[PDB]
Amino acid sequence: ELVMTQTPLSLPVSLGDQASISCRSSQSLVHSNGNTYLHWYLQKPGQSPKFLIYKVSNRFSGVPDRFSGSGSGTDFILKISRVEAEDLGVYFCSQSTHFFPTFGGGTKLEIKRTVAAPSVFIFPPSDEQLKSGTASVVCLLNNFYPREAKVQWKVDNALQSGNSQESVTEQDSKDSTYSLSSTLTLSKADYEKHKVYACEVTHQGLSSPVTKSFNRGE
Amino acid sequence: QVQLVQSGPELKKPGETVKISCKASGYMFTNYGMNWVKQAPGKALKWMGWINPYTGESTFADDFKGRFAFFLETSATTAYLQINNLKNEDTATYFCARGTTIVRAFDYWGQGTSVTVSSASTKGPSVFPLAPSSGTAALGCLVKDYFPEPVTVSWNSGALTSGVHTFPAVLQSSGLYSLSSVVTVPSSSLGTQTYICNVNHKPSNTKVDKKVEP
Ligand SMILES: COC(=O)COC(=O)N[C@]12CC[C@H](CC1)[C@H]1C(=O)N(c3ccc(N)cc3)C(=O)[C@H]12
Numbered sequence: 318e319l320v321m322t323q324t325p326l327s328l329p330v331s332l333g334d335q336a337s338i339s340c341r342s343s344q345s346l347v348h349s350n351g352n353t354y355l356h357w358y359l360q361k362p363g364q365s366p367k368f369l370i371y372k373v374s375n376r377f378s379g380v381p382d383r384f385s386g387s388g389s390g391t392d393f394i395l396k397i398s399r400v401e402a403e404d405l406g407v408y409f410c411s412q413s414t415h416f417f418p419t420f421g422g423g424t425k426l427e428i429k430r431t432v433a434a435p436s437v438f439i440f441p442p443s444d445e446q447l448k449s450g451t452a453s454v455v456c457l458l459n460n461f462y463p464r465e466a467k468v469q470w471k472v473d474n475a476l477q478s479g480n481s482q483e484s485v486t487e488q489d490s491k492d493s494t495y496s497l498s499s500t501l502t503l504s505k506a507d508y509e510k511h512k513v514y515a516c517e518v519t520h521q522g523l524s525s526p527v528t529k530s531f532n533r534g535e
Numbered sequence: 536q537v538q539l540v541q542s543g544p545e546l547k548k549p550g551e552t553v554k555i556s557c558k559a560s561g562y563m564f565t566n567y568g569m570n571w572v573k574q575a576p577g578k579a580l581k582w583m584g585w586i587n588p589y590t591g592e593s594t595f596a597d598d599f600k601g602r603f604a605f606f607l608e609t610s611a612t613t614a615y616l617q618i619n620n621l622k623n624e625d626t627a628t629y630f631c632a633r634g635t636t637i638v639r640a641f642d643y644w645g646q647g648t649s650v651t652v653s654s655a656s657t658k659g660p661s662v663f664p665l666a667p668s669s670g671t672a673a674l675g676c677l678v679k680d681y682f683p684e685p686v687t688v689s690w691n692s693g694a695l696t697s698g699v700h701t702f703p704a705v706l707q708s709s710g711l712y713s714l715s716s717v718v719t720v721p722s723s724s725l726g727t728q729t730y731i732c733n734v735n736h737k738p739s740n741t742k743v744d745k746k747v748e749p
Contacts, residue, residue, distance in 0.1 A: 356640050366632070366644050411640075413639040482707070531668075
């Protein structure tokens with residue numbers, strides 16, 4: 318069967334620069350009938366793939382001219398000259414010259430942009446949840462770059478470990494930033510043992526860690 | 536316009552059967568291939584097979600011989616994928632994609648249908664407001680303790696899309712998912728504009744709407 322190999326797995330690239338994704342089949346993709354059936358798709362996060370390039374070098378309808386396919390035989394390139402924020406996603410090549418059609422492993426294209434500080438918001442647990450018997454405290458870091466961020470929780474000024482979770486969005490398709498939530502989950506009983514609830518953020522954008530807090534019953 | 540609209544998410548027990556539908560519109564149904572592609576959480580796409588509406592004929596990749604069938608309802612321009620004897624390795628997102636045979640490509644895809652194979656019963660989420668306090672204020676819904684993925688979240692019946700982040704679901708030691716959806720908004724509209732998040736978790740038939748106030 319037909320291995321297709323994409324490189325790189327992840328391609329970091331700056332706005333306005335050129336991105337090159339390479340794709341390489343175990344055997345030649347030229348059909349006995351003259352044609353090379355190598356295609357490119359793009360999948361943005363949560364979304365179904367979108368048809369991008371067909372037969373090596375032809376853009377599909379509605380596809381920006383800045384996308385460009387090339388190569389022959391066993392090796393192919395997709396070029397995204399002058400990159401835009403909305404170009405973010407996973408790029409797949411696909412051969413259908415030989416039965417059965419295959420897809421390469423995909424290349425995730427990441428944008429690089431200037432550092433950008435988070436906005437931090439804290440959320441007490443609600444009454445409705447408190448009366449359901451648990452307490453979740455939510456800390457939100459909105460629109461930041463780069464991704465890596467240190468979020469510590471402090472409860473009455475004691476450092477917490479291993480009782481919170483983080484979730485991170487995909488890079489935003491307009492401004493390429495990330496957002497993150499840290500959630501402290503406690504039982505309503507542990508919760509009422511303390512008054513102060515604080516999340517302290519450390520990030521490349523901020524010159525000093527930012528702390529966002531509240532005392533219970535506010 | 537070519538549209539490929541597929542049936543909603545499923546939860547199934549190991550060994551059961553699932554039929555997934557993909558309703559096609561906007562073109563002569565019988566003149567293009569119907570292809571099915573499997574995608575596992577975090578994985579490359581895999582071509583399962585296709586069926587040829589014109590001949591009724593099906594063709595499968597090696598890995599998908601045996602437990603997999605494709606059906607057609609020509610009159611209703613609907614294609615199906617049935618999987619028998621479900622295993623955990625079938626837990627995935629499945630896409631139908633139209634085959635434009637003139638250049639042998641998949642030009643239009645469905646939105647995907649996610650199928651979780653689990654021994655566990657479903658569990659609808661509890662939904663709690665994340666409330667704004669004190670020119671830009673944040674506010675949200677906490678969608679707590681559900682199984683399986685996914686939930687759909689929208690704000691104000693979809694009429695508010697800007698400044699909204701629905702986070703990836705995370706698992707807790709309990710075996711269940713939780714996520715938050717937040718939005719940022721002008722802190723001046725807090726006392727005019729009313730904000731409702733709409734949470735939908737089909738595998739348990741939970742459809743909640745939750746007012747988020749100060
Ligand atoms: C040896 O080969 C085999 O065992 C079975 O081969 C396949 O099923 N090939 C494929 C190739 C691309 C795509 C997916 C798979 C389908 C397609 O569009 N055509 C196609 C080709 C030619 C005309 N005229 C119309 C339709 C196919 O045959 C299907």
